[PDB]
Design a protein around this ligand. Structure first.
Ligand SMILES: [Cl-]
Ligand SMILES: [Cl-]
Ligand SMILES: [Cl-]
Ligand SMILES: [Cl-]
Ligand SMILES: [Cl-]
Ligand SMILES: [Cl-]
Lengths: 237, 238
Protein backbone atom coordinates (compact mmCIF):
# COMPACT_ATOMS: atom_id res chain seq x y z
CA UNK A 1 0.00 0.00 0.00
CA UNK A 2 1.37 3.39 -1.11
CA UNK A 3 1.53 6.12 1.58
CA UNK A 4 1.98 9.88 1.08
CA UNK A 5 4.03 11.67 3.76
CA UNK A 6 4.18 15.47 3.84
CA UNK A 7 6.59 18.01 5.33
CA UNK A 8 5.83 19.74 8.66
CA UNK A 9 3.87 22.83 9.71
CA UNK A 10 4.92 26.23 8.28
CA UNK A 11 4.48 29.68 9.92
CA UNK A 12 4.99 32.36 7.28
CA UNK A 13 4.87 36.14 6.97
CA UNK A 14 2.53 37.82 4.38
CA UNK A 15 4.25 38.18 0.98
CA UNK A 16 6.63 35.23 1.58
CA UNK A 17 6.70 31.86 -0.30
CA UNK A 18 6.30 28.33 1.01
CA UNK A 19 7.30 24.96 -0.46
CA UNK A 20 5.62 21.77 0.83
CA UNK A 21 6.78 18.23 -0.06
CA UNK A 22 4.84 14.98 -0.54
CA UNK A 23 6.92 11.75 -0.52
CA UNK A 24 5.25 8.64 -1.98
CA UNK A 25 6.46 5.30 -0.62
CA UNK A 26 5.38 1.62 -0.61
CA UNK A 27 4.50 0.85 -4.22
CA UNK A 28 6.38 -0.42 -7.30
CA UNK A 29 6.56 2.96 -9.12
CA UNK A 30 7.89 6.48 -8.35
CA UNK A 31 5.90 8.69 -10.77
CA UNK A 32 2.38 8.88 -9.33
CA UNK A 33 0.03 11.66 -10.52
CA UNK A 34 -0.37 14.03 -7.53
CA UNK A 35 -2.86 16.83 -6.94
CA UNK A 36 -2.71 19.46 -4.16
CA UNK A 37 -5.96 20.27 -2.33
CA UNK A 38 -6.35 22.76 0.49
CA UNK A 39 -8.80 23.12 3.32
CA UNK A 40 -8.99 26.54 4.89
CA UNK A 41 -10.74 27.38 8.18
CA UNK A 42 -14.45 27.76 7.41
CA UNK A 43 -14.02 26.32 3.90
CA UNK A 44 -14.36 22.95 2.23
CA UNK A 45 -11.76 21.11 0.18
CA UNK A 46 -10.40 23.19 -2.74
CA UNK A 47 -8.43 21.70 -5.65
CA UNK A 48 -5.34 23.78 -6.50
CA UNK A 49 -3.68 21.85 -9.33
CA UNK A 50 -1.89 18.61 -10.15
CA UNK A 51 0.99 17.03 -12.03
CA UNK A 52 1.55 13.84 -14.08
CA UNK A 53 5.31 13.32 -13.48
CA UNK A 54 5.96 10.79 -16.23
CA UNK A 55 4.71 13.37 -18.83
CA UNK A 56 5.84 16.53 -17.03
CA UNK A 57 2.30 17.97 -17.39
CA UNK A 58 0.97 20.37 -14.73
CA UNK A 59 -2.54 21.83 -14.56
CA UNK A 60 -3.89 24.52 -12.21
CA UNK A 61 -7.20 26.03 -11.08
CA UNK A 62 -7.62 29.59 -12.50
CA UNK A 63 -7.66 30.92 -8.86
CA UNK A 64 -4.00 29.70 -8.46
CA UNK A 65 -2.40 30.18 -11.93
CA UNK A 66 0.77 32.33 -11.61
CA UNK A 67 0.85 31.90 -7.77
CA UNK A 68 1.26 28.07 -7.48
CA UNK A 69 3.99 25.82 -8.98
CA UNK A 70 3.70 22.04 -8.67
CA UNK A 71 6.79 19.92 -9.44
CA UNK A 72 7.93 16.33 -9.01
CA UNK A 73 11.21 14.45 -8.64
CA UNK A 74 10.76 10.87 -9.90
CA UNK A 75 14.20 9.84 -8.56
CA UNK A 76 12.99 10.41 -4.94
CA UNK A 77 9.21 9.81 -5.61
CA UNK A 78 8.49 13.29 -4.17
CA UNK A 79 6.05 15.97 -5.38
CA UNK A 80 6.14 19.60 -4.30
CA UNK A 81 3.85 22.57 -4.10
CA UNK A 82 5.27 26.13 -4.00
CA UNK A 83 2.83 28.96 -3.14
CA UNK A 84 4.09 32.52 -3.50
CA UNK A 85 2.89 36.00 -2.37
CA UNK A 86 1.25 34.48 0.74
CA UNK A 87 -1.77 36.20 2.22
CA UNK A 88 -4.07 35.69 5.21
CA UNK A 89 -6.58 33.73 3.00
CA UNK A 90 -3.82 31.12 2.32
CA UNK A 91 -3.84 29.93 5.98
CA UNK A 92 -5.05 26.34 5.53
CA UNK A 93 -4.21 22.65 5.72
CA UNK A 94 -2.67 21.60 2.40
CA UNK A 95 -3.00 17.98 1.29
CA UNK A 96 -1.34 16.06 -1.47
CA UNK A 97 -3.44 13.26 -3.01
CA UNK A 98 -2.78 10.64 -5.64
CA UNK A 99 -4.88 10.22 -8.83
CA UNK A 100 -4.60 6.45 -9.54
CA UNK A 101 -4.08 6.59 -13.29
CA UNK A 102 -3.12 3.30 -15.05
CA UNK A 103 -0.67 2.85 -17.96
CA UNK A 104 0.08 -0.12 -20.18
CA UNK A 105 1.32 -0.87 -23.74
CA UNK A 106 -1.96 0.57 -25.12
CA UNK A 107 -1.93 3.96 -23.50
CA UNK A 108 -2.82 6.09 -20.51
CA UNK A 109 -6.02 5.47 -18.52
CA UNK A 110 -6.80 8.18 -15.98
CA UNK A 111 -8.95 7.69 -12.87
CA UNK A 112 -10.33 11.08 -11.91
CA UNK A 113 -10.40 10.61 -8.13
CA UNK A 114 -8.01 10.93 -5.15
CA UNK A 115 -7.35 7.45 -3.74
CA UNK A 116 -4.67 8.14 -1.16
CA UNK A 117 -4.06 11.37 0.75
CA UNK A 118 -1.11 12.75 2.69
CA UNK A 119 -1.56 13.67 6.37
CA UNK A 120 -1.80 17.40 5.59
CA UNK A 121 0.54 20.35 6.22
CA UNK A 122 -0.72 23.46 8.00
CA UNK A 123 0.52 26.69 6.48
CA UNK A 124 -0.33 29.71 8.64
CA UNK A 125 0.16 33.27 7.44
CA UNK A 126 1.11 35.86 10.20
CA UNK A 127 -1.28 38.58 11.66
CA UNK A 128 -15.58 27.73 -10.36
CA UNK A 129 -18.52 27.41 -7.89
CA UNK A 130 -18.43 24.51 -5.41
CA UNK A 131 -20.92 21.64 -5.82
CA UNK A 132 -23.85 22.14 -3.43
CA UNK A 133 -24.39 19.65 -0.61
CA UNK A 134 -26.75 19.85 2.42
CA UNK A 135 -24.88 21.15 5.45
CA UNK A 136 -25.93 18.43 7.92
CA UNK A 137 -27.70 15.04 7.95
CA UNK A 138 -28.66 12.96 10.95
CA UNK A 139 -30.13 9.47 11.37
CA UNK A 140 -30.03 6.59 13.82
CA UNK A 141 -27.91 3.39 13.83
CA UNK A 142 -28.81 0.88 11.15
CA UNK A 143 -30.77 3.41 9.07
CA UNK A 144 -29.80 4.64 5.57
CA UNK A 145 -29.06 8.22 4.59
CA UNK A 146 -28.66 9.76 1.12
CA UNK A 147 -26.50 12.89 0.64
CA UNK A 148 -26.98 14.96 -2.53
CA UNK A 149 -24.34 16.79 -4.59
CA UNK A 150 -25.72 19.28 -7.16
CA UNK A 151 -23.52 20.55 -9.99
CA UNK A 152 -23.86 21.64 -13.61
CA UNK A 153 -23.67 20.06 -17.09
CA UNK A 154 -19.92 21.02 -17.12
CA UNK A 155 -19.09 18.88 -14.06
CA UNK A 156 -21.43 16.33 -12.39
CA UNK A 157 -23.74 16.22 -15.41
CA UNK A 158 -21.00 15.81 -18.04
CA UNK A 159 -19.54 12.31 -17.46
CA UNK A 160 -19.22 9.53 -14.83
CA UNK A 161 -16.29 11.23 -13.09
CA UNK A 162 -17.87 11.94 -9.70
CA UNK A 163 -16.15 10.75 -6.50
CA UNK A 164 -16.93 10.84 -2.75
CA UNK A 165 -14.77 11.19 0.35
CA UNK A 166 -15.13 10.65 4.09
CA UNK A 167 -13.17 12.96 6.40
CA UNK A 168 -13.04 12.66 10.19
CA UNK A 169 -12.24 16.21 11.63
CA UNK A 170 -8.51 16.94 11.65
CA UNK A 171 -7.76 13.74 9.62
CA UNK A 172 -7.01 13.22 5.96
CA UNK A 173 -9.94 12.38 3.61
CA UNK A 174 -10.54 8.77 2.51
CA UNK A 175 -11.93 7.80 -0.92
CA UNK A 176 -15.31 6.00 -0.75
CA UNK A 177 -16.58 6.06 -4.35
CA UNK A 178 -15.07 6.86 -7.73
CA UNK A 179 -16.54 7.04 -11.25
CA UNK A 180 -20.03 7.58 -9.75
CA UNK A 181 -20.57 4.14 -8.24
CA UNK A 182 -17.31 2.17 -7.92
CA UNK A 183 -15.99 1.26 -4.48
CA UNK A 184 -12.24 0.88 -3.82
CA UNK A 185 -11.16 -2.41 -2.24
CA UNK A 186 -11.58 -2.15 1.52
CA UNK A 187 -14.68 0.11 1.40
CA UNK A 188 -17.96 -1.59 2.49
CA UNK A 189 -20.73 -1.91 -0.15
CA UNK A 190 -22.81 -0.16 2.65
CA UNK A 191 -21.49 2.94 0.75
CA UNK A 192 -23.02 3.40 -2.69
CA UNK A 193 -23.10 6.15 -5.23
CA UNK A 194 -25.40 7.25 -8.02
CA UNK A 195 -26.30 10.17 -10.25
CA UNK A 196 -29.08 11.56 -12.41
CA UNK A 197 -28.73 14.66 -14.61
CA UNK A 198 -26.57 17.19 -12.72
CA UNK A 199 -27.19 15.59 -9.31
CA UNK A 200 -24.99 12.94 -7.67
CA UNK A 201 -25.74 11.08 -4.45
CA UNK A 202 -24.00 9.02 -1.79
CA UNK A 203 -26.04 6.51 0.23
CA UNK A 204 -24.70 5.19 3.54
CA UNK A 205 -26.66 2.10 4.61
CA UNK A 206 -26.44 0.31 7.98
CA UNK A 207 -25.35 3.58 9.63
CA UNK A 208 -22.76 3.04 12.36
CA UNK A 209 -21.42 5.43 15.05
CA UNK A 210 -18.00 5.36 13.22
CA UNK A 211 -19.72 6.96 10.16
CA UNK A 212 -20.00 10.30 12.01
CA UNK A 213 -17.75 12.45 9.87
CA UNK A 214 -17.85 15.03 7.04
CA UNK A 215 -18.51 13.82 3.48
CA UNK A 216 -17.50 15.56 0.27
CA UNK A 217 -18.33 14.94 -3.35
CA UNK A 218 -15.97 15.97 -6.19
CA UNK A 219 -16.17 16.02 -9.93
CA UNK A 220 -13.76 16.51 -12.82
CA UNK A 221 -14.89 19.24 -15.26
CA UNK A 222 -14.99 20.25 -18.92
CA UNK A 223 -12.37 22.91 -17.97
CA UNK A 224 -9.85 20.07 -17.08
CA UNK A 225 -10.12 20.93 -13.37
CA UNK A 226 -11.73 19.39 -10.26
CA UNK A 227 -14.44 20.95 -8.17
CA UNK A 228 -15.44 19.80 -4.65
CA UNK A 229 -18.75 19.94 -2.86
CA UNK A 230 -19.48 22.16 0.12
CA UNK A 231 -19.39 19.16 2.52
CA UNK A 232 -22.02 17.42 4.65
CA UNK A 233 -21.62 16.66 8.37
CA UNK A 234 -23.27 13.32 9.32
CA UNK A 235 -24.42 12.89 12.96
CA UNK A 236 -25.49 9.43 14.17
CA UNK A 237 -28.21 9.84 16.86
CA UNK B 1 -11.62 52.12 18.36
CA UNK B 2 -11.02 49.06 20.54
CA UNK B 3 -8.79 46.38 19.02
CA UNK B 4 -8.20 42.84 20.25
CA UNK B 5 -4.65 41.61 19.68
CA UNK B 6 -3.92 37.91 20.03
CA UNK B 7 -0.75 35.92 20.59
CA UNK B 8 1.14 34.22 17.74
CA UNK B 9 0.81 30.87 15.97
CA UNK B 10 1.32 27.67 18.02
CA UNK B 11 2.64 24.31 16.68
CA UNK B 12 1.81 21.60 19.26
CA UNK B 13 2.12 17.86 19.76
CA UNK B 14 -0.98 15.66 20.37
CA UNK B 15 -1.77 15.43 24.10
CA UNK B 16 -0.11 18.78 24.96
CA UNK B 17 -1.82 21.96 26.19
CA UNK B 18 -1.87 25.46 24.68
CA UNK B 19 -2.60 28.94 26.04
CA UNK B 20 -3.67 31.80 23.77
CA UNK B 21 -3.95 35.44 24.89
CA UNK B 22 -6.15 38.34 23.80
CA UNK B 23 -5.16 41.93 24.76
CA UNK B 24 -7.70 44.75 24.43
CA UNK B 25 -6.40 48.24 23.50
CA UNK B 26 -7.88 51.46 22.08
CA UNK B 27 -10.69 51.76 24.62
CA UNK B 28 -10.69 53.47 27.97
CA UNK B 29 -13.53 52.59 30.35
CA UNK B 30 -13.32 49.03 31.61
CA UNK B 31 -12.38 45.36 31.11
CA UNK B 32 -14.61 43.72 28.51
CA UNK B 33 -16.67 40.51 28.37
CA UNK B 34 -14.85 38.12 26.00
CA UNK B 35 -15.78 34.89 24.25
CA UNK B 36 -13.47 32.44 22.47
CA UNK B 37 -14.68 31.05 19.11
CA UNK B 38 -12.71 28.70 16.91
CA UNK B 39 -12.79 27.96 13.19
CA UNK B 40 -11.24 24.69 12.11
CA UNK B 41 -10.43 23.68 8.51
CA UNK B 42 -13.67 22.49 6.90
CA UNK B 43 -15.74 23.70 9.88
CA UNK B 44 -17.84 26.72 10.74
CA UNK B 45 -17.43 29.04 13.70
CA UNK B 46 -17.70 27.16 17.03
CA UNK B 47 -18.24 28.96 20.33
CA UNK B 48 -16.10 27.54 23.14
CA UNK B 49 -16.81 29.68 26.18
CA UNK B 50 -16.65 33.17 27.59
CA UNK B 51 -15.94 35.29 30.65
CA UNK B 52 -17.27 38.50 32.26
CA UNK B 53 -14.14 39.73 34.14
CA UNK B 54 -15.89 42.36 36.28
CA UNK B 55 -18.33 39.75 37.69
CA UNK B 56 -15.91 36.79 37.77
CA UNK B 57 -18.39 34.60 35.87
CA UNK B 58 -17.59 32.24 33.00
CA UNK B 59 -19.58 29.98 30.70
CA UNK B 60 -18.51 27.00 28.63
CA UNK B 61 -19.94 24.83 25.87
CA UNK B 62 -20.66 21.25 27.13
CA UNK B 63 -18.25 19.93 24.37
CA UNK B 64 -15.35 21.89 26.01
CA UNK B 65 -16.22 21.94 29.75
CA UNK B 66 -13.16 20.68 31.69
CA UNK B 67 -10.80 20.78 28.65
CA UNK B 68 -10.98 24.59 28.18
CA UNK B 69 -10.26 27.21 30.87
CA UNK B 70 -10.93 30.91 30.22
CA UNK B 71 -9.40 33.52 32.53
CA UNK B 72 -8.76 37.24 32.55
CA UNK B 73 -6.21 39.67 33.96
CA UNK B 74 -7.96 43.05 34.23
CA UNK B 75 -4.66 44.72 35.27
CA UNK B 76 -3.20 44.07 31.77
CA UNK B 77 -6.60 44.10 29.85
CA UNK B 78 -5.86 40.51 28.75
CA UNK B 79 -8.04 37.40 28.47
CA UNK B 80 -6.72 33.84 28.04
CA UNK B 81 -7.91 30.54 26.73
CA UNK B 82 -6.17 27.28 27.75
CA UNK B 83 -7.04 24.10 25.86
CA UNK B 84 -5.69 20.75 27.14
CA UNK B 85 -5.25 17.16 25.74
CA UNK B 86 -4.84 18.53 22.19
CA UNK B 87 -6.00 16.34 19.27
CA UNK B 88 -5.95 16.63 15.43
CA UNK B 89 -9.52 18.04 15.46
CA UNK B 90 -8.21 20.99 17.58
CA UNK B 91 -6.17 22.37 14.63
CA UNK B 92 -7.97 25.66 13.99
CA UNK B 93 -7.89 29.45 14.06
CA UNK B 94 -8.90 30.56 17.58
CA UNK B 95 -10.54 33.98 17.89
CA UNK B 96 -11.33 36.11 20.87
CA UNK B 97 -14.37 38.38 20.50
CA UNK B 98 -15.91 41.07 22.64
CA UNK B 99 -19.55 40.97 23.88
CA UNK B 100 -20.27 44.74 24.26
CA UNK B 101 -22.09 44.54 27.59
CA UNK B 102 -21.83 47.68 29.57
CA UNK B 103 -22.95 49.15 32.84
CA UNK B 104 -23.93 52.50 34.24
CA UNK B 105 -24.75 53.75 37.77
CA UNK B 106 -28.01 51.74 37.82
CA UNK B 107 -27.14 48.37 36.37
CA UNK B 108 -25.60 46.01 33.85
CA UNK B 109 -26.92 45.75 30.27
CA UNK B 110 -25.75 42.69 28.29
CA UNK B 111 -25.48 42.67 24.51
CA UNK B 112 -25.50 39.07 23.29
CA UNK B 113 -23.35 39.51 20.18
CA UNK B 114 -19.67 39.68 19.16
CA UNK B 115 -18.86 43.22 18.01
CA UNK B 116 -15.10 43.21 17.71
CA UNK B 117 -12.88 40.25 16.97
CA UNK B 118 -9.21 39.53 17.36
CA UNK B 119 -7.04 38.69 14.34
CA UNK B 120 -7.07 34.97 15.23
CA UNK B 121 -4.36 32.56 16.44
CA UNK B 122 -3.62 29.39 14.53
CA UNK B 123 -3.03 26.35 16.71
CA UNK B 124 -1.68 23.38 14.67
CA UNK B 125 -1.67 19.88 16.25
CA UNK B 126 1.16 17.67 14.79
CA UNK B 127 0.99 15.21 11.77
CA UNK B 128 -25.72 20.92 21.21
CA UNK B 129 -26.56 21.11 17.48
CA UNK B 130 -25.38 23.96 15.22
CA UNK B 131 -28.10 26.26 13.84
CA UNK B 132 -29.34 25.20 10.41
CA UNK B 133 -28.35 27.49 7.48
CA UNK B 134 -28.43 26.80 3.74
CA UNK B 135 -25.01 25.96 2.34
CA UNK B 136 -25.31 28.30 -0.67
CA UNK B 137 -27.27 31.34 -1.85
CA UNK B 138 -26.57 32.89 -5.31
CA UNK B 139 -28.01 36.03 -6.99
CA UNK B 140 -27.21 38.81 -9.42
CA UNK B 141 -26.25 42.41 -8.44
CA UNK B 142 -29.29 44.45 -7.40
CA UNK B 143 -31.46 41.50 -6.33
CA UNK B 144 -32.30 40.68 -2.68
CA UNK B 145 -31.13 37.60 -0.84
CA UNK B 146 -32.48 36.09 2.37
CA UNK B 147 -30.64 33.57 4.56
CA UNK B 148 -32.53 31.42 7.06
CA UNK B 149 -31.17 30.22 10.44
CA UNK B 150 -33.25 27.52 12.16
CA UNK B 151 -32.75 26.58 15.80
CA UNK B 152 -34.97 25.46 18.68
CA UNK B 153 -37.14 27.06 21.37
CA UNK B 154 -34.04 27.02 23.70
CA UNK B 155 -32.00 29.27 21.40
CA UNK B 156 -33.33 31.14 18.33
CA UNK B 157 -36.96 30.83 19.47
CA UNK B 158 -36.32 31.83 23.09
CA UNK B 159 -35.57 35.60 22.95
CA UNK B 160 -34.35 38.41 20.64
CA UNK B 161 -30.69 37.36 21.10
CA UNK B 162 -29.87 36.39 17.50
CA UNK B 163 -26.95 37.99 15.67
CA UNK B 164 -25.42 37.81 12.17
CA UNK B 165 -21.85 37.99 10.88
CA UNK B 166 -20.12 38.44 7.54
CA UNK B 167 -16.72 36.83 6.94
CA UNK B 168 -14.41 37.33 3.98
CA UNK B 169 -11.58 34.78 3.36
CA UNK B 170 -8.48 35.56 5.43
CA UNK B 171 -10.40 37.93 7.72
CA UNK B 172 -12.13 37.79 11.08
CA UNK B 173 -15.99 37.90 11.15
CA UNK B 174 -17.77 41.29 11.21
CA UNK B 175 -20.99 41.92 13.16
CA UNK B 176 -23.92 42.91 10.86
CA UNK B 177 -27.00 42.51 13.07
CA UNK B 178 -27.62 42.03 16.76
CA UNK B 179 -30.79 41.51 18.84
CA UNK B 180 -32.56 40.14 15.71
CA UNK B 181 -32.80 43.42 13.79
CA UNK B 182 -30.41 46.11 15.14
CA UNK B 183 -27.56 47.33 12.95
CA UNK B 184 -24.26 48.57 14.50
CA UNK B 185 -23.20 52.08 13.41
CA UNK B 186 -21.35 51.80 10.10
CA UNK B 187 -23.38 48.83 8.81
CA UNK B 188 -25.49 49.57 5.71
CA UNK B 189 -29.27 49.50 6.30
CA UNK B 190 -29.53 47.23 3.27
CA UNK B 191 -28.73 44.47 5.82
CA UNK B 192 -31.83 43.67 7.91
CA UNK B 193 -32.96 40.91 10.23
CA UNK B 194 -36.18 39.10 11.07
CA UNK B 195 -37.30 36.19 13.28
CA UNK B 196 -40.42 33.99 13.37
CA UNK B 197 -40.81 30.98 15.65
CA UNK B 198 -37.45 29.12 15.75
CA UNK B 199 -36.11 30.65 12.48
CA UNK B 200 -34.22 33.92 12.03
CA UNK B 201 -33.48 35.47 8.61
CA UNK B 202 -30.89 37.91 7.29
CA UNK B 203 -32.02 39.95 4.28
CA UNK B 204 -29.50 41.69 2.03
CA UNK B 205 -31.04 44.18 -0.42
CA UNK B 206 -29.35 45.80 -3.45
CA UNK B 207 -26.78 42.98 -3.66
CA UNK B 208 -23.21 44.17 -4.45
CA UNK B 209 -20.08 42.29 -5.64
CA UNK B 210 -18.41 43.01 -2.24
CA UNK B 211 -21.29 41.07 -0.52
CA UNK B 212 -19.81 37.76 -1.80
CA UNK B 213 -18.69 36.20 1.52
CA UNK B 214 -19.71 33.66 4.14
CA UNK B 215 -22.49 34.58 6.56
CA UNK B 216 -23.16 33.09 9.98
CA UNK B 217 -25.99 33.45 12.46
CA UNK B 218 -25.52 32.95 16.19
CA UNK B 219 -27.91 32.75 19.12
CA UNK B 220 -27.50 32.85 22.87
CA UNK B 221 -29.24 29.93 24.68
CA UNK B 222 -31.26 29.09 27.81
CA UNK B 223 -28.18 27.07 28.96
CA UNK B 224 -26.13 30.35 29.10
CA UNK B 225 -24.11 29.42 25.99
CA UNK B 226 -23.95 30.57 22.35
CA UNK B 227 -24.40 28.45 19.27
CA UNK B 228 -23.47 29.37 15.69
CA UNK B 229 -25.12 28.38 12.46
CA UNK B 230 -23.36 26.22 9.85
CA UNK B 231 -22.62 29.22 7.59
CA UNK B 232 -23.91 30.24 4.17
CA UNK B 233 -21.79 31.08 1.18
CA UNK B 234 -23.23 33.98 -0.85
CA UNK B 235 -22.10 34.03 -4.51
CA UNK B 236 -22.75 37.28 -6.47
CA UNK B 237 -23.30 36.26 -10.14
CA UNK B 238 -22.55 38.09 -13.41
CL1 LIG C 1 9.49 18.54 7.86
CL1 LIG D 1 10.30 4.91 -2.05
CL1 LIG E 1 -15.17 -4.41 2.38
CL1 LIG F 1 -23.51 -4.59 -3.39
CL1 LIG G 1 4.05 20.51 21.99
CL1 LIG H 1 -37.92 45.38 17.85
Amino acid sequence: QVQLVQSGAEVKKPGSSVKVSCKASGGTFSSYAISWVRQAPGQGLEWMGGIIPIFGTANYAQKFQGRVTITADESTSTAYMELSSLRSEDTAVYYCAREPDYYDSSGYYPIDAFDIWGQGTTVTVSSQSALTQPASVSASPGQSITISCTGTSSDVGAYDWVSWYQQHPGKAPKLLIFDVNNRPSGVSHRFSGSKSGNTASLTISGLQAEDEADYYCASATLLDTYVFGTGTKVTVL
